[PDB]
């Protein structure tokens, strides 16, 4: 990756840039399908802020296959413990499936962090759970 170098500089303001950058790369380095996306919005009484997020299609293994589920989540600095913001990005030709793990707008339900928080689970472990669950239960199946 060539953007990795620029990625670190893209933040330079996180609580743990090092621990954040390493975690990010580790996720993409293991999946090879995900990629860190940049973003920025206003918050402090209306003031844009640098906030990185994850993007890309994650490999979802089926009974005997493996598709590429689209997802995107905001990577917080380190509060309360991990990024709670999690939603799926369905394409115009995709079809979102309602369930305990999905409402309808692609947003992920369930406490997740509020339930476990051992912590035990890390940045890589987080998506791992979604990958495990989404591995059997189709969150958003597209048309053939």
């Amino acid at each position: 990756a060539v953007s990795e170098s620029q990625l670190k500089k893209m933040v330079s303001k996180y609580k743990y840039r090092d621990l954040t950058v390493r975690e990010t790369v580790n996720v993409i380095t293991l999946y090879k399908d995900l990629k860190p996306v940049l973003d920025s919005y206003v918050f402090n009484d209306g003031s844009s802020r640098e906030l990185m997020n994850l993007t890309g299609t994650i490999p979802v293994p089926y009974r005997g296959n493996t598709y590429n589920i689209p997802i995107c989540l905001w990577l917080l600095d380190t509060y309360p413990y991990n990024p709670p913001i999690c939603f799926v990005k369905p394409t115009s030709s995709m079809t979102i499936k309602t369930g305990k793990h999905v409402d309808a707008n692609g947003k992920i339900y369930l406490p997740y962090l509020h339930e476990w928080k051992h912590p035990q689970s890390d940045l890589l472990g987080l998506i791992q759970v979604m990958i495990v669950v989404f591995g059997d239960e189709p969150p958003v199946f597209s048309r053939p």
């Binding site: 296959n65 369905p90 394409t91 030709s93 995709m94 079809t95 499936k97 597209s142």
Partner: peptide, 9 residues
């Protein structure tokens, strides 16, 4: 690769 997502019913 593309997204598309896994099939279903």
């Amino acid at each position: 690769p593309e997204p598309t997502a896994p099939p279903e019913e």
